[PDB]
Design an enzyme around this catalytic site. Structure first.
Site, mmCIF file in Angstrom:
data_model
loop_
_atom_site.group_PDB
_atom_site.id
_atom_site.type_symbol
_atom_site.label_atom_id
_atom_site.label_comp_id
_atom_site.label_asym_id
_atom_site.label_seq_id
_atom_site.Cartn_x
_atom_site.Cartn_y
_atom_site.Cartn_z
ATOM 1 N N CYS A 194 34.683 30.883 45.464
ATOM 2 C CA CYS A 194 34.397 32.000 44.571
ATOM 3 C C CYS A 194 32.895 32.224 44.487
ATOM 4 O O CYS A 194 32.166 31.361 43.994
ATOM 5 C CB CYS A 194 34.952 31.749 43.166
ATOM 6 S SG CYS A 194 34.527 33.055 42.018
ATOM 7 N N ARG A 216 31.010 32.659 40.395
ATOM 8 C CA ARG A 216 31.052 31.585 39.406
ATOM 9 C C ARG A 216 29.848 31.535 38.456
ATOM 10 O O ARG A 216 29.861 30.678 37.571
ATOM 11 C CB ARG A 216 31.182 30.228 40.106
ATOM 12 C CG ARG A 216 32.575 29.922 40.615
ATOM 13 C CD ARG A 216 32.575 28.622 41.381
ATOM 14 N NE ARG A 216 32.043 28.802 42.728
ATOM 15 C CZ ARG A 216 31.655 27.801 43.516
ATOM 16 N NH1 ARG A 216 31.740 26.550 43.086
ATOM 17 N NH2 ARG A 216 31.192 28.052 44.741
ATOM 18 N N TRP A 268 36.280 40.817 37.984
ATOM 19 C CA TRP A 268 36.026 42.162 38.484
ATOM 20 C C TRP A 268 35.699 42.083 39.980
ATOM 21 O O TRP A 268 35.414 41.014 40.528
ATOM 22 C CB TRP A 268 34.894 42.862 37.709
ATOM 23 C CG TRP A 268 33.621 42.085 37.611
ATOM 24 C CD1 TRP A 268 32.640 41.986 38.557
ATOM 25 C CD2 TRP A 268 33.179 41.313 36.495
ATOM 26 N NE1 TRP A 268 31.617 41.195 38.097
ATOM 27 C CE2 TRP A 268 31.929 40.758 36.838
ATOM 28 C CE3 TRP A 268 33.722 41.025 35.241
ATOM 29 C CZ2 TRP A 268 31.212 39.937 35.967
ATOM 30 C CZ3 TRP A 268 33.014 40.207 34.381
ATOM 31 C CH2 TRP A 268 31.769 39.677 34.748
ATOM 32 N N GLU A 283 35.403 43.689 48.849
ATOM 33 C CA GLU A 283 36.795 43.265 48.881
ATOM 34 C C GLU A 283 37.696 44.457 49.149
ATOM 35 O O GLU A 283 38.679 44.350 49.894
ATOM 36 C CB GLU A 283 37.182 42.582 47.580
ATOM 37 C CG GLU A 283 36.515 41.234 47.313
ATOM 38 C CD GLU A 283 36.922 40.687 45.939
ATOM 39 O OE1 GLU A 283 38.007 40.075 45.840
ATOM 40 O OE2 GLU A 283 36.177 40.900 44.960
HETATM 41 C C1 HEM Z 1 34.142 37.600 37.148
HETATM 42 C C2 HEM Z 1 33.843 38.111 38.349
HETATM 43 C C3 HEM Z 1 34.374 37.495 39.677
HETATM 44 C C4 HEM Z 1 33.925 37.833 40.887
HETATM 45 C C5 HEM Z 1 32.813 38.851 41.228
HETATM 46 C C6 HEM Z 1 34.648 37.065 41.868
HETATM 47 C C7 HEM Z 1 34.451 37.147 43.222
HETATM 48 C C8 HEM Z 1 35.278 36.539 44.120
HETATM 49 C C9 HEM Z 1 35.434 36.918 45.501
HETATM 50 C C10 HEM Z 1 34.692 38.093 46.173
HETATM 51 C C11 HEM Z 1 36.319 36.079 46.044
HETATM 52 C C12 HEM Z 1 36.838 36.126 47.491
HETATM 53 C C13 HEM Z 1 38.255 36.703 47.354
HETATM 54 C C14 HEM Z 1 38.891 37.050 48.675
HETATM 55 O O1 HEM Z 1 38.161 37.307 49.681
HETATM 56 O O2 HEM Z 1 40.151 37.068 48.699
HETATM 57 C C15 HEM Z 1 36.758 35.144 45.015
HETATM 58 C C16 HEM Z 1 37.655 34.112 45.151
HETATM 59 C C17 HEM Z 1 38.110 33.283 44.145
HETATM 60 N N1 HEM Z 1 37.796 33.362 42.791
HETATM 61 FE FE1 HEM Z 1 36.389 34.566 41.998
HETATM 62 N N2 HEM Z 1 35.552 36.242 41.227
HETATM 63 C C18 HEM Z 1 35.419 36.489 39.864
HETATM 64 C C19 HEM Z 1 36.171 35.881 38.884
HETATM 65 C C20 HEM Z 1 36.969 34.763 39.023
HETATM 66 C C21 HEM Z 1 37.697 34.102 37.954
HETATM 67 C C22 HEM Z 1 37.684 34.641 36.512
HETATM 68 C C23 HEM Z 1 38.354 33.045 38.479
HETATM 69 C C24 HEM Z 1 39.267 31.987 37.819
HETATM 70 C C25 HEM Z 1 39.275 31.791 36.494
HETATM 71 C C26 HEM Z 1 38.046 33.015 39.896
HETATM 72 C C27 HEM Z 1 38.479 32.088 40.808
HETATM 73 C C28 HEM Z 1 38.481 32.335 42.159
HETATM 74 C C29 HEM Z 1 39.232 31.599 43.151
HETATM 75 C C30 HEM Z 1 40.129 30.371 42.886
HETATM 76 C C31 HEM Z 1 39.005 32.162 44.335
HETATM 77 C C32 HEM Z 1 39.613 31.696 45.683
HETATM 78 C C33 HEM Z 1 40.918 32.490 45.818
HETATM 79 C C34 HEM Z 1 41.685 32.121 47.065
HETATM 80 O O3 HEM Z 1 41.420 31.022 47.627
HETATM 81 O O4 HEM Z 1 42.564 32.930 47.492
HETATM 82 N N3 HEM Z 1 37.206 34.068 40.182
HETATM 83 N N4 HEM Z 1 36.097 35.461 43.853
HETATM 84 C C1 LIG Z 2 43.935 36.820 52.588
HETATM 85 N N1 LIG Z 2 43.735 36.300 51.220
HETATM 86 C C2 LIG Z 2 44.842 36.765 50.361
HETATM 87 C C3 LIG Z 2 44.330 37.607 49.267
HETATM 88 C C4 LIG Z 2 44.002 38.305 48.370
HETATM 89 C C5 LIG Z 2 43.697 39.053 47.353
HETATM 90 C C6 LIG Z 2 44.415 40.232 47.162
HETATM 91 C C7 LIG Z 2 44.122 41.053 46.084
HETATM 92 F F1 LIG Z 2 44.780 42.201 45.873
HETATM 93 C C8 LIG Z 2 43.137 40.721 45.184
HETATM 94 F F2 LIG Z 2 42.909 41.569 44.161
HETATM 95 C C9 LIG Z 2 42.414 39.551 45.344
HETATM 96 C C10 LIG Z 2 41.346 39.250 44.319
HETATM 97 C C11 LIG Z 2 40.516 37.993 44.612
HETATM 98 C C12 LIG Z 2 39.577 38.054 43.443
HETATM 99 C C13 LIG Z 2 39.883 37.371 42.284
HETATM 100 C C14 LIG Z 2 39.035 37.475 41.202
HETATM 101 C C15 LIG Z 2 39.391 36.700 39.956
HETATM 102 C C16 LIG Z 2 37.892 38.272 41.291
HETATM 103 C C17 LIG Z 2 37.642 38.964 42.479
HETATM 104 N N2 LIG Z 2 36.557 39.764 42.638
HETATM 105 N N3 LIG Z 2 38.489 38.836 43.510
HETATM 106 C C18 LIG Z 2 42.693 38.702 46.429
#
Ligand code: HEM
Ligand SMILES: CNCC#Cc1cc(F)c(F)c(CCc2cc(C)cc(N)n2)c1
Ligand code: HEM
Ligand SMILES: CNCC#Cc1cc(F)c(F)c(CCc2cc(C)cc(N)n2)c1
Ligand SMILES: C[C@H](O)[C@H](O)[C@H]1CNc2nc(N)[nH]c(=O)c2N1
Ligand SMILES: C[C@H](O)[C@H](O)[C@H]1CNc2nc(N)[nH]c(=O)c2N1
Ligand SMILES: [Zn+2]
Lengths: 410, 414
Positions: B112, B115, B284, B289
């Site tokens: 993420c 964070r 958000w 993405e």
């Molecule tokens: C608040 C603004 C946030 C932003 C800008 C953000 C941004 C991102 C982005 C760009 C990714 C890559 C997602 C992808 O390519 O599928 C990601 C992954 C992730 N985020 Fe954040 N995120 C946010 C909030 C959160 C929150 C609130 C949580 C948990 C409480 C979280 C936990 C995670 C996790 C676990 C992943 C990995 C997901 C996976 O492995 O499929 N994020 N985040």
């Molecule tokens: C190939 N990976 C499988 C996937 C995926 C996937 C599909 C979605 F519609 C989607 F909203 C997201 C959001 C991931 C994410 C999560 C949070 C908390 C913030 C952010 N900024 N982004 C992830």
């Protein structure tokens, strides 16, 4: 075990068995991955098992494993390590090892070409003058009037560590960099230190923006000596744009020949500390990294200026816009000058095809995703979606210390 | 393992020192001989003997965080947990510990880039939920709170933990808000091709599909191991942004839109050996993405060609970089449409810069910051963002968010 790698765009799964043959470390453990670390952390006794393994895979590759030639070659190497503490590769083994060091280079997206490599044996070299002569012939052959050709020149192997052959240049062709009094930097900022070493050694700098650095060449552990590559051997390309006629007025150029000269080639336990190797450019190497890195030529602001882009907020993506146009210009300029260059779409395309070849005929292909994915437009290239396993096969190219931190001057 | 590990930034020369990795708890998948750092998913409940040390580890870490380690409250909490596991083979988290564990699962999420926000997380305790209708109430309240009329707020709703594995709470949706995909007889796909399998499940479960390009899927909610049930999210709770371009007046004619709230609902939240199999969390968006992956992946909405055509780009050679040119404009339009509608979004330049500052603070204050370079670097313009040049170390700290099997693969239909 057998390991699987999936492409998430095509859902093609490949099965890796080749990883069972690695023995060098990657730097990772079961608890910490160091996949994004750029540099993670002989004797008669260490040498024979390494030599044996390499001779074994050589004779396995020409399909004469356990043959009489294989048997005698093993004994021949045994006696030679015994009585001289080293050994000398055969010509065929030198060529095989060089191609396979390229084949095994997990960070190279260009490996579909690996078996088309011109290998120049320079192990009879004894002086920096001879090194210069060998390198000039390399440059001229590999440049080939723009129809670039892959090549490697191999200088004598390390003996006691006190008589190392070294090309002190990190690459054979680079531009100088000069610290300005007012604190800014003219030329290539990555080369300010090396440039200063050349100046200290007597190089008369023209103090321009694109000054080809002299070669600094060390033979048999002696002090390095300066040499000027004859200018007619250094192919260069003025960068222009197919639509922006103001782009030529930026004054940009680059050289056509990318030639890494600071790495160590290991084959069967032998260490070739001077092995300049060259191919041809992927456009992003110049257009993204060389020109647009903040620590390099850093031209994004200027291009964004002439493009009149809104530069007040990041979310206008002005940097991304100017980035693409710069990389159009580079590709367009090399192509217009009939100088070999590959764009990152074609190169990554070829690399996926190469991976398929390697899994089929070899059982895998070590690849470093961090380095394979291009530094722009990552996920619109096929390698972004390709899982890769990274592991270290030998023969290999390895990093080594910069010579100016090791050399005992005279 | 060595006590200190160093990471370098190759653009700034800043060197950081990591000691937090000594607390890593599970496996990355790498070994000394092979690195699996680009594998998306490398590698029945916990017994009393497995649970005791996992709970103690978490309880110690919680009481260390509030500067009460070794105190009487700490030892009494240890003892109460241990008696509760002994008699019931599980235990219940206090509200304080639940909130702490969820925030730290985010803080520990190596993939993420967002964070820097980890401590500002609204935690909705939904462990009293017993039915899918109640899951629906909880999720609706989450969506409305987090959307906040476009001023989005990060939130997590936590449903009852796993007991014997046959009574799981699950959101069958992988994300709370997604668009349907429909396979046509001729092989083409309408809507979002990623979601064709899940859309088919919903249709089988009784959903009547509008068969459009941007149909918000219903929620498919499983309470207490029962068969899942369908619910339609009230459309007024689903904030959406029509995509227009600031220069290209024809971009609005493409008919594109996207939803404002990214909300992941298929992950497992592990806190002190307890398994929360339904823990939807939302933040958000980072523009790329939507602009890069959702819109321009070949297996997704795949609009590069059509945007290139309207841009009148030379599409005969790859080396004209027509794909890259169109990709930038699509991502300009996404950020421009979200900002014009005052829906929170972050561009990949601001997000990566923030993450570097976060990572540096974590190294100074916490001794490290696990990060997955392959995921942190954005899918466009990688090297002109600061994370590209930043060496990172990846390791698995607990509390954590983990993957889990898709529930249609494991559910025992009643
Ligand atoms: C608040 C603004 C946030 C932003 C800008 C953000 C941004 C991102 C982005 C760009 C990714 C890559 C997602 C992808 O390519 O599928 C990601 C992954 C992730 N985020 Fe954040 N995120 C946010 C909030 C959160 C929150 C609130 C949580 C948990 C409480 C979280 C936990 C995670 C996790 C676990 C992943 C990995 C997901 C996976 O492995 O499929 N994020 N985040
Ligand atoms: C190939 N990976 C499988 C996937 C995926 C996937 C599909 C979605 F519609 C989607 F909203 C997201 C959001 C991931 C994410 C999560 C949070 C908390 C913030 C952010 N900024 N982004 C992830
Ligand atoms: C022929 C066309 C070639 C292309 C298009 C190509 C492409 C590339 C690119 C883009 C990189 C990353 C470079 C960087 O970011 O610094 C790379 C790395 C590398 N290439 Fe190739 N290459 C080619 C030929 C060769 C040859 C002939 C050799 C050796 C015989 C070779 C060995 C390597 C090695 C060892 C690396 C890693 C260098 C390092 O770790 O710093 N390549 N290649
Ligand atoms: C951490 N990076 C340090 C560096 C570097 C660097 C600097 C240069 F001038 C330069 F030409 C290169 C070329 C890399 C390369 C090598 C080959 C054989 C082909 C190719 N296409 N490219 C690399
Ligand atoms: C094979 C590779 O790991 C895979 O395509 C990854 C690359 N990096 C990613 N990074 C993010 N943020 N999201 C992703 O889905 C992916 N996919
Ligand atoms: C920190 C990271 O390992 C470093 O920036 C790497 C990332 N990937 C790269 N990839 C290539 N091809 N070349 C590079 O110099 C780098 N630099
Ligand atoms: Zn690894």
């Amino acid at each position: 075990r057998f390991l699987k790698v999936k492409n998430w765009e095509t859902e093609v799964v490949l099965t890796d068995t080749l990883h069972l043959k690695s023995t060098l470390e990657t730097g990772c453990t079961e608890y910490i991955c160091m996949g994004s670390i750029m540099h993670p952390s002989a004797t008669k006794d260490q040498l024979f098992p390494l030599a044996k393994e390499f001779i074994d895979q050589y004779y396995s590759s020409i399909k004469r494993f356990g043959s009489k030639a294989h048997m005698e070659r093993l004994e021949e190497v045994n006696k030679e390590i015994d009585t001289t503490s080293t050994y000398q590769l055969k010509d065929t083994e030198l060529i095989y090892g060089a191609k396979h060091a390229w084949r095994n280079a997990s960070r190279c997206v260009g490996r579909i070409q690996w078996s088309k490599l011109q290998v120049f044996d320079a192990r009879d070299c004894t002086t920096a003058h001879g090194m210069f002569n060998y390198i000039c012939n390399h440059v001229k052959y590999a440049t080939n009037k723009g129809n670039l050709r892959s090549a490697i020149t191999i200088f004598p192997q390390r003996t006691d560590g006190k008589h190392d052959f070294r090309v002190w240049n990190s690459q054979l062709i680079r531009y100088a960099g000069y610290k300005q009094p007012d604190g800014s930097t003219l030329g290539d900022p990555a080369n300010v230190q090396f440039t200063e070493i050349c100046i200290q050694q007597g190089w008369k700098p023209p103090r321009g923006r694109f000054d080809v650095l002299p070669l600094l060449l060390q033979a048999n552990g002696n002090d390095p000596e300066l040499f000027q590559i004859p200018p007619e051997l250094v192919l260069e390309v003025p960068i222009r744009h197919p639509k922006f006629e103001w782009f030529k007025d930026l004054g940009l150029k680059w050289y056509g020949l990318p030639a890494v000269s600071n790495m160590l080639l290991e084959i069967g336990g032998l260490e070739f500390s001077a092995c300049p190797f060259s191919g041809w450019y992927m456009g992003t190497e110049i257009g993204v990294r060389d020109y647009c890195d903040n620590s390099r030529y850093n031209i994004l602001e200027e291009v964004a200026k002439k493009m009149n882009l809104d530069m007040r907020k990041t979310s206008s993506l002005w940097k991304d816009q100017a980035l693409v146009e710069i990389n159009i210009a580079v590709l367009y300029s090399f192509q217009s000058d009939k100088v070999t260059i590959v764009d990152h779409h074609s190169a990554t395309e070829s690399f996926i095809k190469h991976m398929e070849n390697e899994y089929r005929c070899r059982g895998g292909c070590p690849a470093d995703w961090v380095w394979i994915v291009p530094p722009m437009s990552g996920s619109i290239t096929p390698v972004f979606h390709q899982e890769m396993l990274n592991y270290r096969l030998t023969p290999s190219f390895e990093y080594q210390p910069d010579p100016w931190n090791t050399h005992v001057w005279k």
